[PDB]
lysine-specific demethylase 4D
Amino acid sequence: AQNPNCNIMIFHPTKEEFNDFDKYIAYMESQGAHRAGLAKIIPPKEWKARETYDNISEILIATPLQQVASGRAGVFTQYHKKKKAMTVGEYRHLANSKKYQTPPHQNFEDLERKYWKNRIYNSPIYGADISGSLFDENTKQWNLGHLGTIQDLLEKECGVVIEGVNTPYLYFGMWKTTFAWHTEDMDLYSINYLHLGEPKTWYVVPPEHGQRLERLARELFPGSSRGCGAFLRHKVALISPTVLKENGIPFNRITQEAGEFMVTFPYGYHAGFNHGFNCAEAINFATPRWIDYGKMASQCSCGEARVTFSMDAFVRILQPERYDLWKRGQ
Amino acid sequence: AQNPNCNIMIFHPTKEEFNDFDKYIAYMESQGAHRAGLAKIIPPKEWKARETYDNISEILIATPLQQVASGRAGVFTQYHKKKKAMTVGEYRHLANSKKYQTPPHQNFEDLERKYWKNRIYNSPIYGADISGSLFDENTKQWNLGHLGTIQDLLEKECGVVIEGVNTPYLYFGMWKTTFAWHTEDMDLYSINYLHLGEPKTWYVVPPEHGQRLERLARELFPGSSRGCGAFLRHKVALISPTVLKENGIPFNRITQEAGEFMVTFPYGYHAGFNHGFNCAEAINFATPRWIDYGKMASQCSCGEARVTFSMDAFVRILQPERYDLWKRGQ
Ligand SMILES: O=C(O)c1ccnc(C(=O)O)c1
Ligand SMILES: O=C(O)c1ccnc(C(=O)O)c1
Ligand code: NI
Ligand code: NI
Ligand SMILES: [Zn+2]
Ligand SMILES: [Zn+2]
């Protein structure tokens, strides 16, 4: 078996290999990349997402989110407090202000230490889940707005036509902005491109060990667990690498820099943080190998978890026994 | 000047002419098609949207709408009463039931007479604005899920990058289901493909005469006009061809059949009805010629008009003086 230790693999496709997206995902999996839950892909030197990022300041962040923490430094939850709308230009200025700017640091490891030591004592503001794309329409390779849709994948594999659409989202981050431990909706794949700015550090648990993370989370957030059998779907819980190590949870970490893609694989739990002002674009996607994961995906039915229009058909077709209960939660 | 009488033109592109969508829209306009407000395009015989429609019955209509009329036979409003969810298979069975099925009729003109005589005395159920597509992903020509986005058009023309996405919608209709007099959001173009089933009859006012329709509507719906300076944006008012003729309003009519495209042009008011069970797909789009119409588009700020996520950026960039007032309405 390839990649038995479940290491995060890094790929350097040629421009020829960068033409057929589906084919290259399949290639990565043939080398065992999916066992880690996360892979990095560095585009060929001839490739670019768009010409420049000089004209993005007028994009609106309609609902910036202030991420307020509760708990202890290595085990905490965060809630999202809505703030007034602001443009990307205004947001960038805020990110670089004395209150919010990245501190002096020696290297990525030093900054990681500072993050886990000090995150809970600040409340950074995140510009998340903004429908849109920064890929040029003329970019034909790995354009996240031009991927095959999940609805078409389900139709091709299972023969049923369903409603729903599948479009990309933008994320504008600043120092200490945080994404909580989660898998994707319906345990889909995701792909994330860091367009511009400072790095993003990722943590990931191998899909074959996801249940170990779930069990620890139940122990560490006992009230939350009693409230919902799938509370990690709420995307609010953080556990540090030190605490994961203390509890023997298998995981890996890697830092993504501007110009790099990350792919998360079905049922790969991940979490992470931004180093400073940046912009990323992400979208979910499916392959034939996903279908079995979709059929088995846990669901939140307590009502807390956010849910897109497209989710209904996924649950309806792949999980008909769970559909009525889930629908009541929606 | 081409097409000075503003007649609805019908086009028969060859398979070669069907390759470049933008180029063919520009060609139609060079022949004066836009002066009518509406054009029909019959695809080349070699073209197909998808292989079959045999597997669409499991699509969900989450919120079917019962269209309840008030007023008189030729001048009425309709409101939408929400009904329980049903699949397309269930909806098709309902459309064909004795209560809702198309009556016996001699030809399209006979059915049109019956529609305007009897519409208000029934309340048909419409499956409208369902995000999704029935085009095969391998259909490369005139695939309504693969058009250039409005956001990219605005960026190309005016140099500013904006948030937002632009995806198609499905419409499942039955006898007497009705679309009220309206122009598109921001006076955009639209394109409509009738995938399957019974015909759709359209009425349209030439863009150069849109104000004449607005003035008559103010006279015929005086309370509505007092409530909102752009109340046709609410998409609830119907005026028959007989009443339009009585009041000297220039208009044209045409019936669309399965397998045919209709394009509406900026500020072309249109209305119409379905002949029986059918399914259509539609999306808005822009060209460089649209920008001046977008800048001048009326807006509803009374709060009634529905508004997509994408609308914000359009108003923000093209109509900054109106943005604050419009935003309060949203
Ligand atoms: O905020 C991010 O960068 C991020 C990373 C991974 N996943 C998500 C998500 O919402 O799935 C968001
Ligand atoms: O219901 C339709 O077929 C239809 C036709 C034209 N326009 C619209 C619309 O919502 O713009 C809907
Ligand atoms: Ni994620
Ligand atoms: Ni319309
Ligand atoms: Zn829950
Ligand atoms: Zn209004």
Remarks:
- The two ends of chain A are 41 Å apart (CA to CA).
- The longest strand of chain A covers residues 189-197.
- The pocket of zinc ion (ligand 5) is lined by residues A 228, 230-231, 233-234, 300, 302, 304-305 (CB under 6 Å).
